RNA sequence: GCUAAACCUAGCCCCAAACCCCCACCUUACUACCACAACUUAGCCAAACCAUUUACAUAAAGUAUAGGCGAUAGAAAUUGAUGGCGCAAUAGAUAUAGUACCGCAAGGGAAAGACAAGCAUAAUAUAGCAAGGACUAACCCCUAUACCUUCUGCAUAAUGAAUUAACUAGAAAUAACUUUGCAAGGAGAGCCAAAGCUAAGACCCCCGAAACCAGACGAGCUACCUAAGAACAGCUAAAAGAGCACACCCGUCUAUGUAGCAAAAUAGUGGGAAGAUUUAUAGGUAGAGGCGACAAACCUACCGAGCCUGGUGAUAGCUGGUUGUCCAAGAUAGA
RNA sequence: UCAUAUAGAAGAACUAAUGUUAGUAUAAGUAACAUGAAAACAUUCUCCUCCGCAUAAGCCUGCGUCAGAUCUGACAAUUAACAGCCCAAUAUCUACAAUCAACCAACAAGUUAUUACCCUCACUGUCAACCCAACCAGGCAUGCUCAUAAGGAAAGGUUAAAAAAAGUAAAAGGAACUCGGCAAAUCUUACCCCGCCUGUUUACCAAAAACAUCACCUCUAGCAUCACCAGUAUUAGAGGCACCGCCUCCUUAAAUAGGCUCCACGAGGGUUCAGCUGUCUCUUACUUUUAACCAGUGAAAUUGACCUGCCCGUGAGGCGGGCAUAACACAGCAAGACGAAGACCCUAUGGAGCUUUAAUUUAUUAAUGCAAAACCUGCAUUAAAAAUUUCGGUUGGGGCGACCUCGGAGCAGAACCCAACCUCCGAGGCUAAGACUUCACCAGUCAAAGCGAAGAUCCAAUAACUUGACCAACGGAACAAGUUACCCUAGGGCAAUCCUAU
């Protein structure tokens, strides 16, 4: 008889209490007899770098020059990414300069996103 | 009667009167003495003579019928050969 | 109402299957027939009525021998498990059928009437006039629908060209093609009439309940 | 003795007044839409 | 408050805003246009005026169509224009007896009809009126080809019409291969209902089907901006080079 | 002297103009992840019943026409087309909010923020609608049958009122009468005109049924049924709707209780208690319908017909009310 | 517009709608509620429980710490092995109960072979004094403890008035009480009526002599895949009845009470023997709760105002005539303040029903019959099934029964008019001054002269000249009865004949 409070896993009878998750991802599947099989591939392996010798810290000194907000736009990226190669080669049929026409044969597809932050 | 129509909002007349009474323009109403067409075979000749007559309606009846009819049926009507053309006006009325 | 009727099995097998009672409720959900509900749980044994059914890739009249003649809740008669070839079937048994007997099942109309044992299945024409039959069928190759109840005898009355007139237990006749397969004898469990159930509890056990109304 | 007609049960409550039961019939969608219009923040039980 | 457009103009407004706005003009014209169906269940008054007997003066008259119901099962057949009449009757055909409910339904049949531009036999449910109209029209193909959308009132009929009109417009060989003379004979026999393909594709489509067709027609994978930007770069470089 | 009493705006009403806008979520909604489908308003209500019938620019015209020719209904041809003598916290929207809270559900639906009554300071003194005439004097003396509404008048015959504050009930045509304009013509097209036309001024309330019809919501209580479960000591007797009697179920008789501990309980006394028993869990039957070991019994505390929203401001020849001052005419033949 | 006046406007005025909202009163500081004892705050003692612990279901942080108060905020917490969350496909199978399962005895009849996979423990419940009853001597399934190892506190302090409630004891007598042996104490017997038995029923006034029930009988039905039914005349459905067998004067002293056969049973009804008892003759004592007082917290119906007496009379605290009369608490009582739900009679052209041989219909279904291309469509007839609808007036005592329009005689003695279910009886040529009238209207009535001859309206058939039945409930719904013990709403409520004494 309470309908305003959120509905979460702590609410129903045994069945409900079990079925309803809590926002937590899955990593495996139930086999016969309520046995759980975990898959090493569906567990996010963190990728932490080697921080030794790094010359940057959580904050930046107050003695730094200011600048203008210039968000990176497709034109700005293209300008210094591939354009100079074109111009250099313009003085004497697009995949040679980084163009990727289709995105089935690469591990990190850009659309749809098949990878994670 | 209906004092305001649902579709226009005007007064409306009771058409059961138009088919029964004639309004002489200057107030009077004439009717036709119910009981006159039918059963004319055991009525005395004098009674038949009375029943054929066109009779007037007294004050209350005339006011009632004036209420049950809009303005259109009270106008001045100039018909070509109107048997009641000479009765539209009163002449020499003392009070 | 989500009412999937229980009679959903397709394959045939002698194992009892799990009845679900109805209580008079049809698929909509309303009392269609008053006076039904409750009573003992029951299982259903798929009694096979086409008593002339030859096994896979075989033909010709076949003999089968019984194994047991047991009570059955659904019927009023007593079923019997007959084994033949490589196949077991539940068939309604007649009165004088004991475990171990043998029975013939034929469709072969002989030159004249063949004296048939009191449990065998023969086409109507094959029998003589004046015998008693059960498990009659309306038309050939259809199945037994007529006399099946407990202790009911069906007399054969006469035969004419291509047909036979039989007398049903309700004291009236009907015509059927002479190739319709019946069984000769009287259906088992005789004198089932004389079952004084004694007390209302027995009626409740069977499945009936007392219902006022029936508008 | 009366007054205790509500014997609570989450299964029943979610089965006979829940989102899916409303959305499983035109009348229920009308109910949800009425309660969307009136402003409610408890559309379904 | 008050809207800026009435309620019944909202449909026509919608036909100008969104995806419906890019549909070809002729389809929109065929959709907005309204035509009265040919009278079926009532006797139309012959003339625009008439003398009535009660008084004797010349009064105007119009014919007010009976409203008729077409259950969806008819959309799979060719009922002609016929349908159900849902209404009331006076019990003894005297006005002082109860007002009773009444439904009049057509007598339906199933039959087989041969379409020559389609060279196919269809099984269709029809009514005596449909057969009489077909005979009066000298064949099923003519009946479906000359009758307008409103008199047919059958999505099946309009689909047949779209097929036949497309077959005529394309002049495609698939009608009767291995005998081009018969092809030419059949195609030219109906040469009068020969409208261009661009108008043939959209004949009979309901509005929803039209929207879906337009969407499928225009839906397209966005062009990679890499090609666009390299094209702009090449244009600028050529301009700089020629200077 | 307390209690209080006071305030402004937060907003809103009616117009004009302009056509309006990261993740999860149909399974048990807000849950990363596996093999069907949509397409005539009845009736409350008028006819003083009710049965055909009964409404959803200006002018022509409430005319033709329809109609138990009753109540009432009713054309066309043609004609021509930013603001406020609004509210200001019981008002204005229901709104600070569709929140709190009520209901299982559909659904219902709030409140509010900035020396009035009641008392104390200060209990009363024969006698009496609590006052008036007065008196030197408060009482004492003389006079004096509360108010509203309904019945012929009512001693209170009956109905209503504890008391204060706020809010709460006469909207309009046909004629007529009065005062203006113009006057054989009036009127800013359509209409009237044998002194009439044009304009203004004056006159027609509030609350209340049992009901009816339509569409939704309900079988978590109870009636019955389904699926798959559970309980039944001990003694006597052995396969029994068996006897005595616990748990469990019911509720015979009496007493308590009657705003109660409880909108049906408590204490004792009682019937059944291996069965037609009792019971937890999910599903089903839906309102002229369901269910019923028929009692008009039960379907969420109120069932000879549930409940909610809408038609609905239902209708009511019936009951109750109807608000400033002063004066004047004013009553019981009959069909 | 002056800038309180002259005008124009309008949600324009409340001693009263069991009006609505808010404030505060009265009854009222009244009814009711609560904390076992001592103490050294560590503890000890007295007494009680069909209770307690856990799971389930339900609820969702709801007596853990700290800090502010008499509840608010902050902080903290409940760790999976228990429980939930499941399953690769295809074919095959899958006859025999459970009851310590063995003897007897029954009826209600109760998974694998092949193909594919060599992956590992993630996710959620986990708290409490708890849930449904507005806060609660109520409701709440299962396992285990069967009187407790667990859980609790019947008395805020006092005194020991009445009336009330529960309990204990009682001399002699033992139903004389009373409608009745209800209650209580004791435990026996006998019969009679009804129903065969166990069971079920009016949740919340009826548990029964009613319903159901075995047994019997009657009626209908010859049969497929959604009920009856995976059934088939010894079957299924619908009815009546109620196994079975047999037939279609005594009682008391006294008495209006009790006295088709048919075992068993009944919280059924009536009667009786014996006992038993405070039921009674006839009450009494004590205890507990209530009670009264002190302290804390603190309602509700009710209320026109009250400065609220008695007797007699009128038609009664309040009027009249007499009498009485310093003010004020507290506890009692129930004669009066017509003291604060439920019934009965009548009315409504209110509502809802039930039955019909009351009126209207066949729209829907089922039969036929006729056209339409072996099945559906249209029309007609017959029926069932329903659907909509109504219940005139005066009246013995409301009901029964009569009458209901018009006319004539007494009341109404002498212009006019005046009631009766008061008093006695029948009927269904045309034109035109002026008038009369049935107390309205509608109708009705007389008529000089002059000219010519001697019971309504609407509807239908009609060329017509006009025409009729019903409307007799006779100012007339075009066509509608019986009834509501289940009813609901709005409302109203100086005796002819005689008894007795002088
Ligand atoms: Mg009416
Ligand atoms: Mg407000
Ligand atoms: Mg408000
Ligand atoms: Mg004051
Ligand atoms: Mg008094
Ligand atoms: Mg009062
Ligand atoms: Mg249930
Ligand atoms: Mg009203
Ligand atoms: Mg009246
Ligand atoms: Mg005067
Ligand atoms: Mg003034
Ligand atoms: Mg006012
Ligand atoms: Mg008031
Ligand atoms: Mg008191
Ligand atoms: Mg007390
Ligand atoms: Mg965990
Ligand atoms: Mg586990
Ligand atoms: Mg725990
Ligand atoms: Mg303890
Ligand atoms: Mg205590
Ligand atoms: Mg005390
Ligand atoms: Mg004694
Ligand atoms: Mg019993
Ligand atoms: Mg009994
Ligand atoms: Mg006190
Ligand atoms: Mg007196
Ligand atoms: Mg006192
Ligand atoms: Mg009346
Ligand atoms: Mg009525
Ligand atoms: Mg007389
Ligand atoms: Mg008279
Ligand atoms: Mg008169
Ligand atoms: Mg003369
Ligand atoms: Mg009458
Ligand atoms: Mg009369």
Numbering used by the authors:
A (entry chain 9): 15 to 106, 113 to 137
B (entry chain 3): 94 to 188
C (entry chain D): 61 to 275
D (entry chain 2): 48 to 92
E (entry chain X): 2 to 244
What does the paper say about this structure?
Similar to other systems, the mitochondrial ribosome is composed of a small (mtSSU) and a large (mtLSU) subunit, with their core rRNAs, 12S and 16S mitochondrial (mt-) rRNAs, respectively, surrounded by MRPs (30 for the mtSSU and 52 for the mtLSU). We show that MRM2, but not its methyltransferase activity, is essential for mtLSU biogenesis, as it remodels the conformation of 16S rRNA in the late stages of this process. In the absence of MRM2, a severe mitochondrial dysfunction phenotype with underlying defects in mitochondrial translation is observed, with the mtLSU being trapped in immature assembly states where domains IV and V of 16S mt-rRNA are unstructured, and an anti-association module is present, preventing premature engagement of these immature particles in translation. Given the functional impairment of apparently structurally sound mtLSU particles, these were isolated from MRM2 knock-out cells and their structure determined to 2.58 Å using cryo-electron microscopy (cryoEM) single particle analysis.
Focused classification of the intersubunit interface of these particles showed that this region is highly heterogeneous, with at least five distinct configurations present in the ensemble. In state 4, H89 and H93 become structured and H92 is further stabilised. Throughout these states, H89 changes from an outwardly rotated conformation with apical flexibility (states 1–3) to one where the whole helix is stabilised along the L7/L12 stalk (states 4 and 5) but its base is shifted to a different position relative to that in the mature state. Concomitantly to H89, the proximal H90-91 are also stabilised in their mature conformation, and bL36m (absent in states 1–3) is present. The conformation of H89 and density of bL36m in states 2 and 3 are similar to that modelled in state 1, and those in state 5 are represented by state 4. The MALSU1:L0R8F8:mtACP anti-association module is clearly present in all states and further classification schemes did not produce evidence in favour of the existence of particles lacking this component. Inspection of the mtLSU assembly intermediates described in the present work shows that incorporation of bL36m is MRM2-independent, and most likely relies more directly on the acquisition of a proper folding of interfacial rRNA elements, namely H89, which in turn depends on the folding of H91 via stabilisation of H92, aided by MRM2. Nevertheless, since the conformation of these mtLSU is not similar enough to that seen in mature particles (displaced H89 base), they are not licenced to engage in translation, as seen by the persistence of the MALSU1:L0R8F8:mtACP module.
